[model samples]
Target: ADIPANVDGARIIAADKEPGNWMSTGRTYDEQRYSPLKQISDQNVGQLGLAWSYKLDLDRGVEATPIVVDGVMYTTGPFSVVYALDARDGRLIWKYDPQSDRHRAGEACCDAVNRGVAVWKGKVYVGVLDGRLEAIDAKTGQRAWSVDTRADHKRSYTITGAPRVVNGKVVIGNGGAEFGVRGYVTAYDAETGKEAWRFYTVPGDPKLPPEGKGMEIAAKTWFGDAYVEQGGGGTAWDSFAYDPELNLLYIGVGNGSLWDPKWRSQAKGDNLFLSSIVAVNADTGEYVWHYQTTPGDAWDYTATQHMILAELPIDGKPRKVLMQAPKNGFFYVIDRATGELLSAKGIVPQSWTKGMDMKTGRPILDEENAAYWKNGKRNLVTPAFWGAHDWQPMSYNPDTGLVYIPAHIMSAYYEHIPEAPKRNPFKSMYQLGLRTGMMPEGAEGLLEMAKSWSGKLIAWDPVKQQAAWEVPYVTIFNGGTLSTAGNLVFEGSADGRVIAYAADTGEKLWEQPAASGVMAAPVTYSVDGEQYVTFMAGWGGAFSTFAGALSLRAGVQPYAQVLTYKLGGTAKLQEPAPRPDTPKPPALSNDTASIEAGAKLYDGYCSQCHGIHAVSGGVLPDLRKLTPEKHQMFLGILFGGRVPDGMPSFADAFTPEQVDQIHQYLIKRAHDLHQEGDTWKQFS
Candidate 1:
């Protein structure tokens, strides 16, 4: 396989300085998210003020990271609804609705949202949360092609990550290794929409055994009978990094199906290739060298974290190193050359283990944290299912020789729930609801947890494996970090604060609180000689939703504000309030017609995304059996403060007369779906 000869197609640098702001999920082709702008340096960060603002008028916690080109921005919401916005004034340019009508929510094993949009050539691409890869004209917002990756919504398969383009080929990896769908990354021709090559992340498929020449080597690692016959874990749900010089693509794979390996298989040798990093030939999609970060990972540790590429001098020679802080609470420095382990260290509060074994590059799992079920109780895994460091990307400064990571530390207690594995194959476990780092009560409690979980803006010396400087804060989560040539590091917090820290010593230079929590990564761009920093503020991802639940329960104000700050500017914009809904109560009706009419409306509209009986196994809701009383209460709230949950007040979309009918319909459906029981029952 050869790299494309087209110079523009095989280009190394982006069009504009920050052409791919939503690059690789987190701004940066390598997921490093580092900017080269200097105008907003530490000296001027103190004078930073709001340059502009944009308010999203949709129902959702906006988990999207906007992809920007020239001055245009692109992003998406829960239903894979795409939007084009003016970069300068936060004005809507155009919007594309894929109308991805699939009940992927309750069925989704993870969060229900779209991460972002991908840009390649002159087109923008995104995988709707339901299960379609769509490419639209970047400028005109016209659809190019819509391809279904996999449409099995019952068992948790969906698309939430933006696609990545490499060498005239669009590469996309689907989510749902959790629901047992085979994980594969397919590259399609940028122009023709033809699948150029496909590579399965996990080994399986009797019809298509291992291909190319590496089968012999990979097969030897697995011990058993035709192991590839059954689907193995390895969902590439996040970002991919590329090496232009090597023409190789790197994928970060997610967890294997069953959170507990005892249920997955008895096959030996670290489950072969599930939770690991594999380098593949970009042209042929053939496996190169592979490295497993954790063997026999029963803790639901996903390898689908951010990978940053750098050509740093190692051992007096320039070595291409790939850095990642995966879900397993460790930072890895791998030799991109042969998948060799160079170094690994813990980044956050980890009780699962101490550190990685230098030689084997595997974790020294504590027997107690093996995450197994002995009698009736299971050993609750640390880092919980959320992971130590999640999908957020970290930034690095070459000049300062420092790496900044957006990290968190938390713990949970788990017990079996005996439910049949749904879309995401987690063995039903009761989340003991032990608030690890954050308490359930007040701002003081949250601040205390933030103090514990908010990892240092530690200026880490990669070589020394030591912190040169560290600063901690009270945050629900850390946004992606961005390093600039101006000697500053920019990051946001789930608590609505965006701050700038000195790259050299972790000194705080600037800070501002937005309307809502900020969870998306931050990006810096140069318009003229001036540099600007921007980030999305609408807490709606897995952590934000989950944490916001706790935050809401604790009564903190919920907001969804996007803020932009520039050096030496004092511009102020109106802080928009997140529209709260006042769900009108269902008209008192014991009559059968209202119930029947309601059911039809729900079936026609709501059930498309929620499910037939409201027993949402999709990522949305198990809305089947809500009692009349519960229905009224839930509706009131859904029409109220909980408007951020994607179900708008519906007061406008549905008339008051219609809302009453839908309420009756939802109640009936919920009652019907509740009989199945939530427990998975089976040994087969």
Candidate 2:
């Protein structure tokens, strides 16, 4: 295969086509994310086997989309652990542990997770949790160079998305919209690891002229005094798609400055370039044409969804098309040329807006659901802040002229939680800000209702502008979708089930449970005439925050497991080890000095989760109020069962004596609170 004449004369194919490495982030340069090999088809897909499984040592959160080439699979995990595994044997070739700074966790607006990696120029490029982009040699797995993208992490910027390389330049963007920091995408010299050009999504402090030529149209859309002075909201947090023929790069923007427009300002504001899709010239960081997905967005409708390229008949014309179901609850099909909207459909239920104007590209707003500034007043928005479809990928098959979407039809009520944003263990106002994102109070059957609506495999045809099929799932679908030449579509759900559906009719062909919730997209690659499907099965995404209450109420077990399935073998995943009983350490007999030091440590580490006064405030549990026996059970659950949930095992992070002092502090607080209650005659 030689070069295509149209792509600005650049060798789009960096590596030879061997049907091995899923070269670019999305397999091929077009980001179709479709595998050509037909070793696994819908007919034989039922016989799809299991080749090997690797349980990542990490237990936090996993959002890795593994890339395979020549039998080697490269993936990224929480805190940016890059691993190279032998695809055939699931044997770890090398693991690059870039110990992320502990402080960075506080800045992460969402969970600390990494999307995936990009392989270019014989090196694997990855964005670390602590805001550094590092290139590790494929053979040695050692850092080739590290570029500090955060400018020393000053504005609390962290990178969780995968890096994309275009024209010998590795391009990356930072995540920090919630912190009011300006967002941007940068390109560095792939060889020297030196800075090449920097483009700021929003022109703010240390400002530069608007970048990516096409952005000028978007910049003019800002309606305020020097809108660039305030950081813009464009964030390329997920993988991007490329059309080698047109030499265009497509990426979705993120939620607006403040999630709630009420906080940013009362007047309806459309911050330019914040909530839009950008088509930029790959050779130079210059915007080509863009279409705003959500203008003046106040519902946290993140446009940072996935994009895929395909050629479909549009209005009787065979035109290249790009499809996406962004967080705004709309299915969009845009002409890859001139950024013209061909069709826009709402796949899930949405109430914040009625629909979009085809000619003007503006949303028909529902005034009742729009954000209001009156104190104590609330607004309900469907598809909630998490949006109808979150960061997961939607698959397209030209064969069936259908797009497979994994969507969630959820809703949220925006009201004041009436609590101040204070540092951990201390509840205060303004230390952080306000907690305005939430669902309605006492809403039962939400999960079931969401499942009934969004928990389905929706096969839609943009060409026909109609629904092809809808297959309901008990669990809401939340992972990326992958299409195959075998007439099979692979997708996963949040409840840990992976299923293969017939691309044409949305019929189930194969099923299996994963080690944990599947948050990343599934990919199928063929090696040595054998087909293998790989995906990361781990929790922690938008749901890691308050949205988790939905999972808890639904009685879902949480685990972190990365699974790779092949053809025709069954491998059962064992349940996690039972939580151990951790008794409080023996009463401290140490000197007063040691006890004082232990108190400080307790305040730092344990107090945040367990709470001051040992009251726990129900975040953990009422530890101080428990009896000695109950305290032991509480300690056990904290130290054992949920180690991944934040309770570090004392066997490593602390000494037995130190633990004793911490427990002693808890005991003293409990005793004092108990006595005080008794004196007041209010004891339980």
Candidate 3:
């Protein structure tokens, strides 16, 4: 492996000047995720071929954007495993596995996936899955120092986001808002791993005084002590940006606990700081300003999406602006200096709000779709809980003046539950105190209505605040984007291919089969004067594991491989194996009483991974597609400790009668699919 140059604070500050190497997760402080290398242009992208491939022992998602410095590459894998490889070829230099506790896997709302790692001052940093922050030696891949970043272990906190290094302070946050936990970001001294400063995103217990000016002001917006029990979920789980000139660090906050503001805050005032972008002094961790994207958020609409800062001419004046297409289905451009909304408009099918009030920066609520106030009635909403755009990164090309966003169109039927959920460790998703019924109406009769999920590549103009062009995708969720100086935009497809498109227009120019889905953002860099494009190919995420029916692909196996491409290269990937036919289900003879009992058991235990109504989206094995042998061994699989793959045994979690009830429910669901004619064929 090549020894890269030492990355000091000065080197990282000037990362934009050194486009040949990716020094940070977002490449630069602006977090634009755009590359300047142009050796592989739109005219010559057809000549691109695989330069090398490195295999990883992973079956879950690969969401890392490996940072390449000089000719050395550093990245992370599932469970926060760090790897250093040679940039010129796919050869491992060092690998570090944190061996995180598997018990905490249930605490993570999504699968145990890591975004990436950060390198600064000869050390690589990773936020471990078990709520620990560790620094590894860049040269040896050994632990340098580690510290627990969580405020409390009882809150079920987990860290999945990559740590960002700002001004020699390694900043990190935790995720467990879905499981009821407060949100905060902590900064640690990069050299010695000592706590530098900590800033809480939401107000703490009202019984005690506020911590700072931010918390004091935020405390006023929240009411009722129920938030104390739910922790007022504002976890800063993912997005982060730093501005060197202003010394401001930006953090994107998550949603409230239970997802229903009425339940969490007792239907009071706006829950300040939840689903908001908070800016603080980078060095001191003092609050600067904040702009709430979803005040009193109720639909799991998180502000913790990718954010980018850029200087653009607005109304004939050059303005420094921050851009984000968060889960709310609207693209927002805000003045980065003052935290003022400059422009906001819906980019997808949005039925939650009429529009944003430019004067007050509040949403004009769509009365019909306000499920929070509709009592127990069901309300249909677009850009559902999965979000119009998830954590996948977007790209901004200064040359084209267009932001490439990976957008999706999906809807969820939110039916409020009057009764609160009872706390049970096995009922992980049910404890959210929101929806008792996960499936939407007509899901059983018309699966097409349930399958109304698709993706698109949107080329949006920030100055005009409108989309210039759009390209549809084969699947609902796809890969992130990477733009370059060569007038090209590169992205990996959910249909198992890497594609290149014209940055100025939405024209598909080149495509190559990856044999598996791709979710990580694409990155471009140079090694030995020959430019190369690199991205990881794997297929497991929240949607895939939970909504398997919507993202199904025949014969697609989860893989962990770093695929690098360069012009005139001739390497090739092995062809995907043939898909096995689904096994026929057993006879549906369960009584109505047994089937109903089974449904309750399945909702508590199986719904999280198997799908809401036994309709898999293809990340995990669909129980309906199980073999006859599996059906015979159903009890053994559930309670006999069948722990070969990632599936955990539930021997202690379920009783014999409960197991029988679940098996009956699965059989009934499989029979219903079989009776649905060709709709079941889509699962195959």
The per-model lDDT (C-alpha) reads 0.62, 0.65, 0.82
Q: What would the per-residue lDDT of candidate 1 be over residues 1-684, giving only the tens digit for each residue?
A: 221112234333563344323334445556666776676788878989888876665534556666655566676765678878766666888889887654234334445567687776677788876677888877677898877777343344577777777888888887766445667788888776788988776555434566655454545454443333234667888778888778889988777655445445542557656768889998898888888877776666888887888766667877789887788877788888788787777766576786777766778867665444333545545676667677766778887877887765555554443542333122111111111222322333433443334333456666656667777645435577788878988887665578888899887888887665566677776544456678776655555334432222211233444567776657675554543432333344576798777765654344433433333322234344344466657547444334444443443345556667777666544443233222211100
Question: Clashes in model 2: which pairs?
Answer: 21-68, 21-69, 48-567, 48-568, 49-566, 49-567, 49-568, 212-286, 212-287, 582-636
Predicted structure with the largest lDDT when compared to the true one: 3
Runs in model 3 deviating more than 4 A are: 1-5, 425-430, 440-446, 553-557, 581-589, 625-645, 649-653, 671-678
Instruction: Judge candidate 1 against the unseen true structure and give its global Cα lDDT, from 0 to 1.
Output: 0.62
Candidate 2 Cα deviation (angstroms), residue 412: 0.7
Taking all chains together, each candidate's TM-score versus the true structure is 0.78, 0.80, 0.94
What lDDT is reached at residue 240 by model 1? 87
Q: How close is candidate 3 to the true structure, as a TM-score?
A: 0.94
User: In candidate 2, which residue ranges exceed 4 Å CA deviation?
Assistant: 1-17, 205-219, 223-230, 262-269, 374-376, 416-435, 439-454, 475-477, 553-555, 570-572, 579-684
Q: Write the per-residue lDDT of candidate 3 for residues 504-587, one digit (tens) a residue.
A: 987898889886888889888998899989888888777777666656632256777888899987887854456577778888
